Amino acid sequence: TKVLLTEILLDPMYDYAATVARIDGSIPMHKPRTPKEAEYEFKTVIGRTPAELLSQKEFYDKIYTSKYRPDFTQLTRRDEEKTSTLIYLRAYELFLKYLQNAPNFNSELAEFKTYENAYGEQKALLAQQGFYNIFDPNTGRADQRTRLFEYKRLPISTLYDERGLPHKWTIYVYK
Amino acid sequence: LRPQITYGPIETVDNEELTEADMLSFISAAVNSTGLIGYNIKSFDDLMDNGIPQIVKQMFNVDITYKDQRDHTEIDKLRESVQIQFNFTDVNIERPQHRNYSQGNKINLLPNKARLCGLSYSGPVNLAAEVILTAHYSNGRQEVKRASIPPFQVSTFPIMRGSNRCHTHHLSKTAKKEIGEDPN
Amino acid sequence: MLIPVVCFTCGFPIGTYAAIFDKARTEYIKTKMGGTLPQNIPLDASLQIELKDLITALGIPMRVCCRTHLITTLDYRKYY
Amino acid sequence: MKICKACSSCMVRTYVDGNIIFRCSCGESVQGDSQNLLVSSKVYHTGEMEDKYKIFIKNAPFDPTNCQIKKDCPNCHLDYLTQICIGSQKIIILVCRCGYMSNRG
Amino acid sequence: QACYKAAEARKKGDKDWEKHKIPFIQNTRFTPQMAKDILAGTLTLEDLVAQGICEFITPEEA
Ligand SMILES: [Zn+2]
Numbered sequence A: 001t002k003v004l005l006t007e008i009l010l011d012p013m014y015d016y017a018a019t020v021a022r023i024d025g026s027i028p029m030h031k032p033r034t035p036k037e038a039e040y041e042f043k044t045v046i047g048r049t050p051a052e053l054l055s056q057k058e059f060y061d062k063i064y065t066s067k068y069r070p071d072f073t074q075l076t077r078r079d080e081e082k083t084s085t086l087i088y089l090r091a092y093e094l095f096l097k098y099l100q101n102a103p104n105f106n107s108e109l110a111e112f113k114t115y116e117n118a119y120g121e122q123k124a125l126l127a128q129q130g131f132y133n134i135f136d137p138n139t140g141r142a143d144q145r146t147r148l149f150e151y152k153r154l155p156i157s158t159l160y161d162e163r164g165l166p167h168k169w170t171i172y173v174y175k
Numbered sequence B: 001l002r003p004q005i006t007y008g009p010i011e012t013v014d015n016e017e018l019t020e021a022d023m024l025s026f027i028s029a030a031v032n033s034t035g036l037i038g039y040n041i042k043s044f045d046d047l048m049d050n051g052i053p054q055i056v057k058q059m060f061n062v063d064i065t066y067k068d069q070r071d072h073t074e075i076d077k078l079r080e081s082v083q084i085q086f087n088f089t090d091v092n093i094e095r096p097q098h099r100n101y102s103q104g105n106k107i108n109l110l111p112n113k114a115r116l117c118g119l120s121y122s123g124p125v126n127l128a129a130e131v132i133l134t135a136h137y138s139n140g141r142q143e144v145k146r147a148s149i150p151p152f153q154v155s156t157f158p159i160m161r162g163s164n165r166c167h168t169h170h171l172s173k174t175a176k177k178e179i180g181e182d183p184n
Numbered sequence C: 001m002l003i004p005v006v007c008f009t010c011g012f013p014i015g016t017y018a019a020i021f022d023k024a025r026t027e028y029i030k031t032k033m034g035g036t037l038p039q040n041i042p043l044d045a046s047l048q049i050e051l052k053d054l055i056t057a058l059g060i061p062m063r064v065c066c067r068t069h070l071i072t073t074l075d076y077r078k079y080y
Numbered sequence D: 001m002k003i004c005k006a007c008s009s010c011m012v013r014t015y016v017d018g019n020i021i022f023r024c025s026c027g028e029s030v031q032g033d034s035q036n037l038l039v040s041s042k043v044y045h046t047g048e049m050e051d052k053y054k055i056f057i058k059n060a061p062f063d064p065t066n067c068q069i070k071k072d073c074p075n076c077h078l079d080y081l082t083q084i085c086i087g088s089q090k091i092i093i094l095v096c097r098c099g100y101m102s103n104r105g
Numbered sequence E: 001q002a003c004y005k006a007a008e009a010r011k012k013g014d015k016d017w018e019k020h021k022i023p024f025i026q027n028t029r030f031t032p033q034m035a036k037d038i039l040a041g042t043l044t045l046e047d048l049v050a051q052g053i054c055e056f057i058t059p060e061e062a
């Protein structure tokens, strides 16, 4: 019993099923303080007593299943928080189906992945600090003016005088 | 074959209105198509589905001959070598599994449990084979015994997280978030 | 993980107008977003999203530090 | 080298009484007449000879990564040429796609 | 071809042979509308390659 409890209590599946059970009140919101509360939580979440889990053979067949069965066919696109609730509940239901190797699973997984991608697009819309572009007043868009170097073929008179000698700018004129 | 498609003349393309900040969309598109580490997942995926099966089924055919080091017998004294010949036919790799309690039925092993318990996120490898043993006699004839072996699990191969053989691949982002994984 | 209760620099009570500043800002972005995917907002190269008047209407003064921390602080709820 | 007529092997060259005699491992012996009077040779500056860059100079007008220059080609009167700078003495060659090539080659 | 025609006109004694030349134009086919379509999610790198706008270059091909 101790080894079984230690193994299952450290399974993230158990914690996720326990959270789902806590949402609708099947188990107390506080973690167990006494062994009786732990046994009750195990019975509610896993669905089988630890003594009878060692006797029979399945494990995933009777894990909690949320009480409220909302309609996930409105996931086909007070509405937005309900959509978030539907996303959470369908994620739990699909994860539980994945554990149980339920038939007709990959197509529903892809459909819910598309739904959650749309929901993630909305959530990313909620997660924007903003953006600004310094517009060039002469134009109507992002500034292109720069102080970069621009090549230009200067006249040869700048380097050599009328007698072909190079310039030596070495006299300072002060006014 | 010669190319046949033709595009619009380059003199009609209007790009005088472009800005450098507009060209960041090209980098955005390139990263979105590429991803950031998508090559790692693709490489592990075609190692699983295509690489290891090919390596096992092609590059590990065994053909050896060994001396018969037995004692004296009618057949014994008259034979000198035995040829061991075998190859692997069927190869596959499954998702990581863990045995709950003792003598269970190999429930799934999530990555967070492997991290916490110090376990190995490795998936079983199942192989099938056919074996041929050929024994050579002194006179010149030989005897051949052939046997086909049902598929069996030899060991477990490490599984990259997020690949096709990972459990965090048949799960949604919310489920990934709530099982102790990083959804992002 | 949220907008701080007070400005990190001086300590003005930014937090008491934080939540509102979040939600309102969203609609303003929805007004200026424009035919563009949300995650591509910081790459539009044509946006002029200014939040000066919103923060002014919130009553927050024109302090550099306070508006900096109000605008730039990431929210953990929006990434997790 | 001298190739044996009989077995098509590389014959060994020795020198006897003012003559070059090739002797093979199969016993066949011949004497070279004129074309085998070359004991050894070496060529210097092999990294900048004209035979080095013949293919590259031929392909230069079509290679898009070569430097162009605004000069008229005297053959086809094209207003641009391809300028290449080869060798340690920085020899400049102007080439065009019509076959024109400065240095008259 | 404009250079050839201009040279051919000059060899015929024509004075305004320069009028047969055309300016050189090199440009990319990436338009500002394509940038706005990338941001809207209706234009990806795969269909930019399929339209002959960009291509993948390897260091030895570079
Ligand atoms: Zn402040």
Ligand SMILES: [Zn+2]
Pocket (backbone or CB within 6 Å): D004, D005, D006, D007, D008, D009, D024, D025, D026, D027, D028
């Ligand atoms: Zn010979």
Ligand SMILES: [Zn+2]
Pocket (backbone or CB within 6 Å): D073, D074, D075, D076, D077, D078, D096, D097, D098, D099, D100
């Ligand atoms: Zn030419």
